[PDB]
Ligand binder design. Structure first.
Ligand SMILES: COc1cc(S(=O)(=O)N(CC(C)C)[C@@H](C(=O)NO)C(C)C)ccc1F
Ligand SMILES: [Zn+2]
Length: 510
C-alpha cells in the first residue's frame, strides 16, 4: 500500500481546484490552520500601572469562569511583565492555599477575557456548535467569523467523488482530553503509561456510536506518528459526495457540519505503545441529528412519566454538535439515574415542577455555556458570561451541564448535577419563603451568618460564597459514599440542619 502514490493521486484529483485558488482564498485557508494569536505586547501597553502590578500578584488558576484555553495565555502574559528575587517571591505561597479570588481581582479578569481571544475559526465553530450568531463575542468579530466561514464553505465545493472515496482511508490524530477532559486524565493507565485501562477502554466504547463535526476537520492522507498526548488515532472513510480541499504536505480539509458513524473502536499497538484506533464513516449530519432528537424525545417521555409531569413537557435538552456526540446523550441518562437514586422522590418532584413553571431545562451539551441560550439571553454583557462544567441559571430556571470539560476537583458529572440541583433547591426554598419577590434562601439573614462561621469547613470551593456553600453541602449530603455525608453533619452541623430544614419545608408545602 503506497503512501506516496496515494498522496499523489489525491493531489491530482484536486489539482485544478488548487491552481484555481486566489491568494485571498489561499490565505483564508492558512488563517484557518494557523489562528491569529493576540499580541501580548499591545495588551500590556494598554494596562494601567495598578493593573500591571495587580497582574503580577494574582494567582490565576483560582478562577472558575475562564477556560485554561484562556488561562494558559494570561500566565504567558504574567512573566513578560516580571522582567531580582522576583520569580521566587511572586510565586512563593502558591501551594499554601487555593484561596478564592478577591472581588476586585475577579472584576479585572472578567474584563481582561475580552482582550485575549485569538481569531480561531475552527475554535469558534466548535465552541458554538455552528451557531455562530451566538452573542458571546464582539459583534464585529462575530460578523468577521461569519464572512470567513461562508467564504471557506464556498471554497470547499468539490466532492471526493465516486472513484476515490472507497479506495482511501484518511487519518486524524487527537488528544483524548479534547473529547473528555474528565475520562482522559485517567484513561492512560496509572501504573504504565504505554497501555490503556481496559475497564476504561470499554467505558469509552459502550457509549460512542456517532460523532459530529461542526467545524472543518483537517485530516492526514497518510497516518502520522502520534505526538505526546495524541493517544487517539482516527481512521476515516469519506462518502462519495463529501466536499474537501487539498492542503500542502499531504492533508485534506473537510467540509463543516458532517456526521460520523463509529464502526469500530479498538486498542492497537504502534511502536511499543498502546493507542485507541477509531474507525468512522462519514454520513449526513441530519442522520445523526435525528437520532439525537429521537433520544431527546425518548428520555423526556421516560422522565415525564417517572416525575408525574404532562406527557409533552420539554424538560431535558440535548444540545449536541461535536465529536463526542453520543456519550453526551448516553451520560445524560446515567446522570439523571444517579440523581433519582440519591435524592428523595418528593424533593425531586416539587423542585422540578417549580423549574417547569418557569419553562426551565436540564441542558446537556458539548458546546460552551456562554453559547447556551438559557444563559446568554439573560447575560447581555460578555464579561458576565460564564464557562464552566456546569451552571444553574435562576432567571431561566435551568441547569446547564457541559460534557467535555473537567470539573474543579470533582469526581463525576453525576455529583456535579446534584450540586446544581442544590442551587434550584436554594431558589425554590427562597421562593416559598416569599413568593412576591423571590430571592435565594442563602440571601437570607439566617444563612448568611451561618456561612461566616461554618463556611470554610467544607470543600475548598464551597468557600466562594453563600450560594456555592449551600450547594456543596447539599451535594455532599447526598453522596453515595456514606462517609462524606457524616462530615457535613460534624464539620458544619448548622448548615446540615439548615438544609434539612429547607428540604422539610419544601416537601410539606401544599
Ligand atoms: C465536576 O462536574 C461539575 C463541575 C461544575 S463546576 O464548574 O466545577 N462548578 C462548581 C462545581 C463544583 C459544582 C460550577 C458551579 O458552582 N455550578 O453551580 C462553577 C464552575 C460555577 C459544575 C457542574 C458539574 F457537574
Ligand atoms: Zn455552584
Amino acid at each position: 500500500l503506497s503512501r506516496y502514490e496515494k498522496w499523489e493521486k489525491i493531489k491530482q484529483h484536486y489539482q485544478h481546484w488548487s491552481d484555481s485558488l486566489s491568494e485571498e482564498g489561499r490565505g483564508l485557508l492558512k488563517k484557518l490552520q494557523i489562528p491569529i494569536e493576540p499580541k501580548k505586547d499591545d495588551i500590556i501597553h494598554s494596562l494601567s500601572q495598578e493593573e500591571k502590578e495587580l497582574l503580577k500578584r494574582i494567582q490565576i488558576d483560582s478562577s472558575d469562569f475562564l477556560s485554561t484555553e484562556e488561562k494558559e495565555f494570561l500566565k504567558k502574559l504574567q512573566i513578560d511583565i516580571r522582567d531580582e528575587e522576583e520569580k521566587e517571591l511572586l510565586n512563593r505561597i502558591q501551594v499554601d492555599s487555593s484561596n478564592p479570588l478577591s472581588e476586585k481581582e475577579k472584576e479585572f479578569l472578567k474584563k481582561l477575557k475580552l482582550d485575549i481571544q485569538p481569531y480561531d475559526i475552527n475554535q469558534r465553530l466548535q465552541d458554538t456548535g455552528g451557531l455562530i450568531d451566538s452573542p458571546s463575542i464582539n459583534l464585529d468579530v462575530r460578523k468577521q467569523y461569519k464572512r470567513d466561514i461562508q467564504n471557506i464553505d464556498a471554497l470547499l465545493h468539490q466532492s471526493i467523488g465516486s472513484t476515490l472515496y472507497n479506495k482511501i482511508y484518511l487519518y486524524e490524530n487527537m488528544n483524548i482530553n479534547n473529547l473528555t477532559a474528565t475520562l482522559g486524565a485517567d484513561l492512560v493507565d496509572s501504573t504504565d503509561n504505554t497501555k490503556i485501562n481496559r475497564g476504561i477502554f470499554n467505558e469509552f466504547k459502550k457509549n460512542f456510536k456517532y460523532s459530529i463535526s461542526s467545524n472543518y476537520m483537517i485530516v492526514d492522507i497518510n497516518e502520522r506518528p502520534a505526538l505526546d498526548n495524541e493517544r487517539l488515532k482516527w481512521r476515516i472513510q469519506l462518502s462519495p459526495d463529501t466536499r474537501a480541499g487539498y492542503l500542502e504536505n499531504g492533508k485534506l480539509i473537510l467540509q463543516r457540519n458532517i456526521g460520523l458513524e463509529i464502526k469500530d473502536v479498538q486498542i492497537i499497538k504502534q511502536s511499543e505503545k498502546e493507542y485507541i484506533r477509531i474507525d468512522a464513516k462519514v454520513v449526513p449530519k441530519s442522520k445523526i441529528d435525528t437520532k439525537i432528537q429521537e433520544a431527546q424525545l425518548n428520555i423526556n417521555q421516560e422522565w415525564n412519566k417517572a416525575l408525574g409531569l404532562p406527557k409533552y413537557t420539554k424538560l431535558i435538552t440535548f444540545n449536541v454538535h461535536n465529536r463526542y456526540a453520543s456519550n453526551i446523550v448516553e451520560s445524560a441518562y446515567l446522570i439523571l439515574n444517579e440523581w433519582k437514586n440519591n435524592i428523595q422522590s418528593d424533593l425531586i418532584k416539587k423542585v422540578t415542577n417549580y423549574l417547569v413553571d418557569g419553562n426551565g431545562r436540564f441542558v446537556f451539551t458539548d458546546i460552551t455555556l456562554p453559547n447556551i441560550a438559557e444563559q446568554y439571553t439573560h447575560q447581555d454583557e460578555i464579561y458576565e458570561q460564564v464557562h464552566s462544567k456546569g451552571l444553574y441559571v435562576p432567571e431561566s430556571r435551568s441547569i446547564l451541564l457541559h460534557g467535555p470539560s473537567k470539573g474543579v476537583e470533582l469526581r463525576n458529572d453525576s455529583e456535579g448535577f446534584i450540586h446544581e440541583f442544590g442551587h434550584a433547591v436554594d431558589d425554590y426554598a427562597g421562593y416559598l419563603l416569599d413568593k412576591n419577590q423571590s430571592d435565594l434562601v442563602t440571601n437570607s439573614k439566617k444563612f448568611i451568618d451561618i456561612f461566616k462561621e461554618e463556611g470554610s469547613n467544607l470543600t475548598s470551593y464551597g468557600r466562594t460564597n453563600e450560594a456555592e456553600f449551600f450547594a456543596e453541602a447539599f451535594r455532599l449530603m447526598h453522596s453515595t459514599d456514606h462517609a462524606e455525608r457524616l462530615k457535613v453533619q460534624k464539620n458544619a452541623p448548622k448548615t446540615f440542619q439548615f438544609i434539612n430544614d429547607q428540604i422539610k419545608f419544601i416537601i410539606n408545602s401544599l
